[PDB]
């Protein structure tokens, strides 16, 4: 039967505070600007730190010391006046100051447009003049020539006065404004303004009335009284939040708020004294204005006039400045490679582990007889007495820690590992996860965190384990995969060779082959056929191959032994490649499953490293092989250049043409020497059995590393072999003379100097790039954060198709890569006629995708977030596969964040690119701005030469016709009537995303944005699923604008969320009422981010003061729907394991 | 603004 | 590790499993290890997850055990609990 | 030269 | 360096680096994002309450751990109570509400 409870907060209300409420907050009034006594250092009575008001300095102990124990609790000492309770209450209890004269709150005055000003219909200047005593503003005349609610001159004020008593009166300062606020009746005024909106004029009248009505209605509904914007009682913050404390040295340190409060109290008390002493009006005016200034300074410092300063060098910290985590059980250290580790493990230093796990260790040492009690356990453990170690081993058993490396760009920046205690001070990290952390061992450090609860630990072991996240949430490709040495090893053992030494051996199976390979006569593999049984065919569990003897290599034979156990014998023996190894791992993941693939990954690592070490791969100066052709090509280039010089001095060609020809000649020469380098390494001669010379790829280290994908690029390789090239000037122009030298030879000082510029520009680029990429990531996170998978399905077939995306070549960037992991929107069918392909409302699968590929090319159709009709989110089918773990995204997954991190993470790779990506995500109206996106579908050309408005042009659809006014200059591809293209877009320059939205609708914008973003990443060769970009685009298209109200309360031109107008429209239409007609609105990620309704989130984003004043005025309530609100609250977020909990609550509340 | 200036005036 | 994919297979949408595991572990911690088979190693979280893998715990079954447990709480009390309430009027 | 026409 | 529990700050009550107590690492916005994308609600909640500024939560967590237990009841982070009280001193009425 109702009644108050504990915690269980379901809502937060914000409102203007009445003086009554402010006094209800107050335990006592602070009457003195005293702090503490100079001698006793105890709090001065009735001052800012007084114990009678805020609380006892010491727990359960009154000031004079009469009552020192918890025996008395709630008791108030008769002698000293102090209640006996916990001193903690000094953080909670609040005071107040009673102002002798009202003072207007600064936020509701100086923030533009002023809320007080807007309510009272007073311009900033007038409100300033009245509040700060410059002029009197006549109020409530109810007759006479003089205008009510208007200002006046003193001589005028008097002259007027003479003409009538009990007429319009007005007292300068906050008293007048408070009077206007109390006396104004909002009901009557909304009535009047509503009558005013009837006025026949089209513009300038209805809009203003609409804004005024907006504010008025805000006040009407909220229930707050306008006069509350003027303060009578000014609240006083608890002392512990503005402390005066003794530092280490015995010196005192104080929060600036204490000083601000002191100025306030001083001026207020002095004002009371001056009033009681019947001071002249000039002095009382000065004091009142000073008081207003002091309150101003206390609330916001610097908003109005010069900010108050302790000293000129620093300004005081006001409440506004105050308004706008570090963790326990955490550590950090330098990281080192841990090759011997399993993917789910990490090396954790013993000392670190002893500190991190100390309470658990105490508990366990108490459970076992190792110590009598926790205290004894601690005293013992610091000693480090033996068996404490074994106990620590017992403690961390099955337990997992979190490892994190800054910057955390995506969710794999934090992963869970099972700790292996190790001697030494370094954290040992597994090599396969270095990619995901972007971690290397040149001195990087990582932080460790200990999940405490069973719930947290379960979250870590299930959701966060490195071994459970083997593939990128962005591209769906493996994230934890072999890199560097591993590849080098595998490639070394899987290499074609003349193989004269070990050729012609039947393996007797992988086992005997392995024995012999380790034995003798086999080195760097061999051209020998192996007997191993292969198979593992699927569509049946039986598997098995009757005969499996195939040409192979000792390393190749070895690989099959290494637990592949998932077919692809053909894939083996094809020689190792980094890309090939990644593909092998992925295929193994799909066919053979996750756990077993993890084991496969570990095996591939182990073997890769093992052979990598014994390969003997190294780099000598002679391993950088120059081409004899270089001197020839250089001589040729010199000759051609001389020919161009002679041809120039003749006057046949311009300076420009000559420059261009020189640059081109040199470019081609650089290509030539590159080719020569790569050719020289690429072919080699070795003796064949018969005696013939065979041509092998070669095992040269630069070449081997390059070909294997272990390390290197052709451009880099040519830098030690072939002539360097052309340098850029700082202006960007290309120097005439190239760098003939190559790093093996070494280059002249001038060449190096002329380089330093490029080098410097590079480092500066990367350094700035981290900062910019971070910003993009944060914008995307802020815009997409509320998105979550809210249900399995929403019931709409609607979706997009998507094309091959290749502009001309058509070769790459299409088909299954784009299609895979999606859901079919329609019963798509393979080939002409009979058709009947079997996937409808079905998640695309690799086997199914292969089916679609086999049956020629498919036009295709697909479920997408863009077309998802789910209210306040997306659904499992429309999203498709969770790319980190092949399956339909588990309900409750927070898609938005994942999207933001997926797009944001390779930000530093785009280079400065990234500005283009941000330009697209922010929906900028591109400068060239073109195309006649009129969709009238008809055309009648015209004129009316009025500058830009000259061209004009008219479309003439059979039903109706319209007129658009263009701009001088430019050209058109289609001219004069006939409506050549219904799409039109006659002018060149790329349509604005907004123009594209109005003319072509939502689907076209989703297509355009996704493809145009993808162009950038592709140009940088980065793999990213369209899905995330679709999430973000969906957030961009969130807003809609009403064209016709219908039967609803909504106004024409009013903007509102898609979901809200859809729900409303279904309500009306199912209620038999005319639905609202609406038009799609597209806003960039910034504007969308700034859009969100909840005030805790918004205020925690940016622009805290504005958000908080508007919220407080409107009397808003935060329902805690999103993540930010709950995080701030310290609540369990409505996502993941929390998503399940949140729903039950939401339902219970409704 | 500037109460000093006002007061001097 | 621990064949986690199979454990998640036992309970769709990953998240739920975690809660179940956690809840089960709490039970284990609160009173009597008891339960289903008994690898007897790697603490409460691993034991709960492994138990889940053999569909031993189950989301519904745990609820059934609790509901029966509520009846067990009913047991004892009963007439003696009815005594405390009947005495007062 | 290398990166940035440097390298 | 590493820390289990240790010195806390006066106003914020967040873990603070002492002279013998190492202090604590910063779990920032991006790390929070990381935990959110994992849908790890209780880990995040631990970061935001028991492991940082909540006196009751951290004392209860420590005691529970040395006695062997599940996560303790959260309490609003002390810095949120600080924010609320600071907004009250600004003169705007802030009200925690029931369902
Ligand atoms: Mg590094
Ligand atoms: Zn006393
Ligand atoms: Zn959907």
XYZ file of N, CA and C in Angstrom, chain A residues 1 32 40 95 118 198 334 346 363 403 413 506 530 561 578-579 588 658 667 844 932 1112:
66
model
N 0.824 -1.202 0.000
C 0.000 0.000 0.000
C 0.863 1.259 0.000
N 26.891 34.448 8.768
C 28.192 35.086 8.903
C 29.147 34.606 7.823
N 41.605 28.521 17.485
C 41.172 27.145 17.719
C 41.081 26.307 16.443
N 22.932 24.611 3.186
C 22.546 25.805 3.910
C 21.815 26.767 3.003
N 12.272 36.413 -22.744
C 11.295 35.816 -23.650
C 9.898 35.751 -23.039
N -4.235 33.963 -35.936
C -5.261 33.992 -36.972
C -4.943 35.010 -38.067
N 54.968 -2.733 -18.476
C 55.503 -2.861 -19.825
C 55.201 -4.262 -20.343
N 47.676 -15.001 -20.545
C 48.625 -13.891 -20.512
C 49.628 -14.091 -19.388
N 40.757 -14.003 2.039
C 39.624 -14.881 2.253
C 39.986 -16.348 2.160
N 42.864 -7.192 -20.007
C 43.998 -6.415 -20.476
C 43.520 -5.327 -21.420
N 40.244 -3.569 -27.848
C 41.273 -2.866 -27.104
C 41.287 -3.335 -25.661
N 58.517 -41.720 -50.907
C 57.138 -41.995 -50.540
C 57.104 -41.859 -49.032
N 53.536 -37.516 -50.562
C 53.193 -38.031 -49.241
C 51.931 -38.885 -49.233
N 49.677 -32.827 -40.526
C 49.808 -33.482 -39.234
C 49.312 -32.564 -38.125
N 50.644 -15.059 -45.938
C 50.005 -14.394 -44.807
C 48.500 -14.271 -45.057
N 48.151 -13.829 -46.261
C 46.759 -13.769 -46.685
C 46.195 -15.180 -46.772
N 38.760 -22.679 -41.782
C 38.753 -23.640 -40.692
C 37.730 -23.228 -39.648
N 58.386 20.780 -71.218
C 59.692 20.203 -70.916
C 59.724 19.594 -69.519
N 59.641 9.154 -64.006
C 58.654 8.244 -63.432
C 58.782 6.872 -64.080
N 21.820 -15.120 -44.951
C 22.728 -15.581 -45.988
C 23.843 -16.392 -45.353
N 19.937 19.492 -61.281
C 18.570 19.972 -61.146
C 17.702 18.801 -60.726
N 15.435 22.637 -17.008
C 14.898 23.049 -15.716
C 13.620 23.857 -15.894
